[PDB]
Structure formats: C-alpha cells, structure tokens
C-alpha cells in the first residue's frame, strides 16, 4: 500500500514534449483510479492562476480521484514557441492527451473526465464532442467561448487590438509573441456544433464577475442534453476571491464525486 | 554524450516537499555546469509570469549554464498552505536550496549564482548577504524591496488594506488565504543591512514602468561594492512586453556569461 503522491509526467505529441503533473491517490500497487484531466487557459500554465488547479488536483486526490494536468504545447514548461501556437494544435493535443493519460498505470480508462478553465474549457468542449465515448463527464469553468467572436468581429483579444499584427509581425501577449499562424487558424475552429456531440453529464460554472458574457454559457446549455449551469454570484474568471475559490472547489468536487465515484 | 534535458527535482525543507525544475545543458556523462538558481516572486510560481523564468532557463541551458528553479514552500506545487507562509521561512528555504542544489550531480558548486524576480530578488539579496561566500554572482530583476515599507507604513499589500487581518484572520490574496503569521513576521526582516554584506558582482535590472519606486534599486547600489544597475526604458515589473522581454533575457545572459563562463 502506497500513500498518495505527486509525480511529473511527460508525453510526445507531434514532435513536442508536453510536461505535466499527476496527483495519484492512496491505494494498493497497480490500482486504477477514476481520473480527471485538466486543461488550462490561454497563455496560462498547468498550475492555473494562484494555485487554482493545484488545489483542485489535491482535493480530487484526497477523495480517491487521480488528477492530471499538462502544459499545452507552446505553454509553460512544454516544448514549443508561442509564436507558433494555434488553437487547432491545442485541440489535437487535447485529444492525444486522452490516450496519453489513459495509458498511465494508475488511470481507469473507463472512469475518465475532463475539466477546463477559460479557453481550456472551450478546448475540453470540442475534444469531448470529438471523443465523446472517452468521457464519463465534462466540467467547464468560466468558458472563454466568446474568443472567436471577440477576435473576428470586435478585432480584440482580451480587449487588446489585433489590427497591428501585420504591422508588428506578431501580437504581444504579456511579453510572449503570438504569431500570425494563430489568427489564420481561427477560421478552422467550430465550438458549438462540435460541443453538442457530447451528451454525457456536463457541468458549467460561471461567475457573475467574469468578463466573458454569460450568454456563451447559455449557448452551451442550449446544445447539451444533460447539462447543469451553476451561476456563482460574484465569482470571477479565475476564482480569485477566498469565497469563490472555496465555491469552485466544492462545486467541482461535488460534480466529480457524483459522476466518477457514485 | 548527452543532449540537454529538463528534469523535475524535489527536496525536503522543514517538513515540506519543495518541487522544482532543472534545465541541464548538453554534456558528457557526469559533467558539472555553472548553475543559476532562480527565486520567483510573491504568490508566484517557478515558471514566473508568462514563461519568464522558463525562457531564461532555456537561454542559460543553451549556453552551457544549468538553471534550477523551485516553487517556494506554500507556493505553486510545493507543500504548504499560503495561510502559513512567512518571509522568514522563504529566507530559510532559500538558504537550504543553495545547499541542496550545490549537491546536485550536474552542478559545479564553485560556479553558482542566484537570480531573482520581485520578492524573489529581495530574498536572493538577503540570502546572498548571509551566505556571502556561496555565490559567484547575483542578479536581481524588479526587486520588490518596498514590501516592508508598503505593508508596515502604508498599511497596504499591493494596494489592498492589511488593517483587517487581525479581526478577520487572514488577507485575501487572489483567492488564497494569507495568515496573520506572515504579517507578524515582518518585524523580523531586514533587507539592506543584510544585502550589503555580499561583495561579489551584482546586476540589478529595473524597468521605468515598474510600480516599485526606482529609489529602492539605488539603495541596493549604495550598499554594493561591485554593482551594476540597468534601467530599461518602458520595462515593467514582470517584463511583459515583447521588447522588454528580449532586453531582460539578453541583459541577464550577458551578465551570467561574464560571471560564470568567462571568469
Ligand atoms: Ca493519505
Ligand atoms: Ca506520442
Ligand atoms: Ca523535446
Ligand atoms: Ca543541444
Ligand atoms: Ca511531502
């Protein structure tokens, strides 16, 4: 019998090494656990903001659910330059990470779910529709499903103009160079028609102080046969208040207990 | 022969597992390399913001300098609750990390330096002064040396009031609880009298848009026998523009080439 452990994991997808962390519950040798794979947001890292995914991972681990989270390609400690990042490759990696994680010794291939934050929720929704028979459930926090509308119609990315990409040669995201390839690839992305292909249990948690409009969470619900939408009064995009951090962890543990343990 | 590699490392300090990443250059079996140990800022993680420490780590690694960076206790993936965090224990961990990292198999303990960002620069400056023979050189980005003055004199932590910590039991830092122990421990901290004990090469990089007042960088320089201050026009606290990111990486590689590869 081995106590719980935190270990570091890697995988190779399309020639990039993706680097991640796994939180494995207490158990006997060779035990396979229900597992949540977590997708971080745009230009974020696998910890997410202010220990958010770390706290969620430990909460799951203490309750018998393994938690795995990788840096996407061109993010965090994974290989790849942000200038080469495209959302299509994030989607390819998210699908490939299902098989990478289900191959791990401690993961029950039949009790496996996705959790997302922000753009990671958008990726999770699309991967879930394309790999619907792989997922026991799907949980989406603060989904950034407005990102196509904002960039393509309002010509901004998180409020900053995208109209100087040709003049500058890049878009400046907090000191990272985001390339033209990202913007050229946006025409290939479909969120909601792909997302409605997943008809397992879905939970969406939206905070009223999120800068993403609430209507995008309702649009997801319009397409889900088994959706639940929780509106957290005065929650924000990253669950960056003490009360809303407790709320997001509790609501999510409740959902994964119901769908992966009960 | 071995190509460069990224490996994950852990060490135990005062009952907490601290978790870190090491970037090891290309080399022969058992080769040892000049090494930079990096200290992140307050409530940050070992990647620092927007890949900052990752980019610096890879730049060093590509040039034959190993880079090591841990989450401090109560930060990132390391053990410890933020409610229990104190700066004194950060200083103790920084001291213990010098010893743990100097014993790593790929580290040349005779060519070993610290790099800091923000509060990590303050920690680096104090540890460097207390362990004045241990470091080949010291580089500080955007040192947050105002933090005691801000909390103790202006009664704010990054602009938010600290006056309710005793009544309410904690301070809310972006969803994390920061306990009274942190605030009670501030009286134990001395920055500048400790920092001036280090007499090796020091480089400070300050951006004109940093919210930390420039005067604090001059106070450090006033106590350093062998200091250099670079002032980056339009640089900010976290080096969060493409031009200022290029500048900070280039200036720091230049300093570590001089102090770790050419000396
Ligand atoms: Ca246990
Ligand atoms: Ca593979
Ligand atoms: Ca690789
Ligand atoms: Ca090489
Ligand atoms: Ca431990």
Numbering used by the authors:
A (entry chain B): -3 to 258
B (entry chain A): -3 to 259
Give sentences from the paper.
The LbFAE monomer structure includes 260 amino acids that forms the canonical α/β-hydrolase superfamily fold with a conserved Ser-His-Asp catalytic triad. The two subunits associate to restrict access to the active site such that only single FA chains attached to arabinoxylan can be accommodated, an arrangement that excludes access to FA cross-links between arabinoxylan chains.
A variant with the catalytic serine replaced by an alanine (S114A) was generated to enable binding of different alkyl hydroxycinnamate compounds. Several S114A crystals were soaked with substrates, including MF and MS, but no binding was observed in the crystal structures. Thus, the refined crystal structure of the MS-soaked S114A variant instead contains an acetate molecule in the active site that originates from the buffer. Wild-type crystals grew as either triclinic (P1) or tetragonal (P43212) crystals under identical crystallization conditions, whereas crystals of the S114A variant were isomorphous with the P43212 crystal form despite being produced under different conditions. The unliganded wild-type and S114A structures do not reveal significant conformational changes compared with the FA-bound wild-type model, which suggests that binding of substrate, and release of product, may not require major structural rearrangements.
